[PDB]
């Protein structure tokens, strides 16, 4: 349907402003939006957003009410809300019964069409007791207020915009919607330390539609430039493919790009390694890459189990005419046991919590992605995003 996320975005952002502005020893919890078994008896809410008028007139905003009333119609326990911004309005305004009927009224031809869909027998006074309306200010000023508040709290100015705030809102979005056994309330004291200790970045549906979208990508892109300039260095990837969309098809594109930019030269001595965690079947991808033009190094002499010395070897290279014995390394994480003699200069964890190759003298960059294109952009493979 409409699925106008800006409403839920406003709602979670306002909750965030509350949490940052909260007293010690206080538990605040939120109700998960409907659009996600309907867990929680009265912990569900749906919203819309609209801010284009010079003065407050209830007439113009017909649309949200129809679907919300229909939504109440569809099922019973579950609350409903709304947020909009017009000049000259604050607070909550309770409509009357005749006023809501006028919204019910077929004032226009579309509305006469729509009213027929809603049932004849429906509550209105109980509905109003059950549904309230809330006003809001301009959204961009609100997003600015959140960041200004965090500055006032005390954080490094550069670190705030890039990493702290999106990862912070991510927890709100996880709590709002989940299917597991755990609590639904956040205390500021335990909340803040968690975010301050852990460093990682997140790209996902809600994170994309924010004020600081452009400022998020470039700040990261600029960090990895020093690393990717080098001709020869060890790089290791760990991907978890459950969440990513259209993995089977896009992974080949990504690999061909990475090899054509970073493993197609005579001074490119050490190829990269890809390790996939899951229940994946590698033979298909291997065959497809063979059809593409590339050749892989599996590690298996007899297709039973892996040998570490063979997976980490150096290939033969001929200069003119140019050839490579192999251009990449592929394996499954579980099967591999042990570690290399030399430590990785970089390790890229994608959708992964921990790994046993970590150490102090090894760099570790982490991400949480829903589309692979954002990584193609992060690694300079493509010019633009969305």
């Amino acid at each position: 349907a409409e699925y106008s996320i800006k409403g839920y975005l406003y709602q979670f952002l306002k909750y965030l402003s509350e949490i940052l502005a909260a007293g010690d020893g206080a538990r605040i919890t939120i109700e998960g939006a409907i659009e996600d078994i309907a867990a929680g008896l009265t912990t569900a809410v749906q919203c819309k957003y609209h801010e284009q008028a010079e003065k407050y007139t209830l007439g113009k905003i017909y649309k949200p009410i129809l679907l919300m009333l229909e939504h109440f119609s569809k099922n019973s326990g579950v609350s409903y809300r709304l947020f909009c911004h017009f000049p000259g309005e604050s607070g909550t305004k309770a409509l009357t019964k005749d006023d809501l009927e006028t919204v019910l009224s077929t004032k226009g031809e579309v509305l006469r069409a729509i009213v027929a869909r809603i049932d004849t027998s429906v509550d209105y006074e109980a509905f109003l007791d059950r549904f309230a309306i809330e006003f809001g200010p301009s959204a961009e000023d609100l997003q600015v207020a959140v960041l200004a508040s965090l500055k006032d709290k005390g954080f490094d100015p550069d670190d705030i915009d890039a990493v702290i705030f999106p990862n912070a809102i991510q927890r709100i979005v996880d709590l709002a919607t989940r299917s597991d056994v755990n609590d639904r309330t956040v205390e500021p004291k335990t909340f803040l330390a968690g975010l301050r200790e852990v460093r990682r970045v997140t790209f996902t549906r809600w994170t994309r539609e924010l004020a600081t979208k452009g400022r998020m990508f470039s700040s990261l892109r600029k960090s990895l430039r020093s690393c990717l300039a080098h001709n020869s260095r060890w790089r290791v990837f760990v991907i978890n493919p459950l969440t990513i969309e259209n993995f089977d098809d896009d992974i080949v594109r990504f690999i061909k790009a990475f090899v054509q930019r970073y493993s197609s030269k005579y001074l490119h001595s050490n190829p990269p390694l890809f390790m996939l965690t899951g229940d994946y079947d590698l033979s298909v991808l291997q065959k497809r890459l063979y059809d593409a033009g590339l050749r892989c190094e599996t590690g298996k002499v007899g297709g039973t189990d892996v040998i570490i010395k063979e997976l980490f070897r150096r290939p033969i290279l001929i200069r003119n005419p140019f050839r490579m014995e192999f251009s990449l390394r592929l394996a499954k994480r579980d099967e591999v046991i042990g570690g290399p003699q030399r430590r990785p200069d970089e390790l890229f964890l994608i959708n992964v919590a921990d790994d046993e190759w970590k150490h102090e003298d090894v760099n570790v960059h982490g991400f949480k992605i829903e589309r692979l294109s954002d990584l193609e952009y992060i690694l300079q493979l493509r010019s633009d995003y969305a």
Binding site: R225, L228, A229, H230, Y262, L267, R319, N320, Q380, S383
Partner: protein, 104 residues
């Protein structure tokens, strides 16, 4: 930024003040002879995601049997990153085996 095509040749000697490039196939040289005269500019690779611009100062062509040799001498002027930024003054040094391209 755009696709730069297929290399004309490779570095044999390098220095802060001189780069020497060698072509071994007559067909390629005839293909791009128009764009390899003195005064015209070439793009040399120095690492991933970085290019250097150089000016041709000399061209020599010799055929000897013991097949073809074409030498191009170049003097750097500046650098040009992938995103499309130019900066005068390059203290960098290209390593042999790198590639040269004609400037579109």
């Amino acid at each position: 930024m755009p696709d730069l095509g297929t290399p004309i040749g490779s570095v044999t000697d390098s220095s802060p003040s001189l780069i020497r490039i060698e072509i071994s196939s007559a067909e390629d040289f005839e293909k791009y002879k128009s764009m390899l005269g003195v005064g015209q500019y070439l793009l040399v690779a120095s690492g991933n995601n970085l290019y250097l611009l150089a000016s041709i100062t000399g061209v020599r062509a010799t055929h000897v049997e013991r097949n073809f040799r074409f030498q191009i001498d170049t003097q750097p002027i500046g650098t040009l990153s992938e995103d499309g930024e130019f900066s005068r003054g390059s203290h960098s040094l290209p390593v042999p085996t790198e590639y040269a391209y004609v400037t579109p």
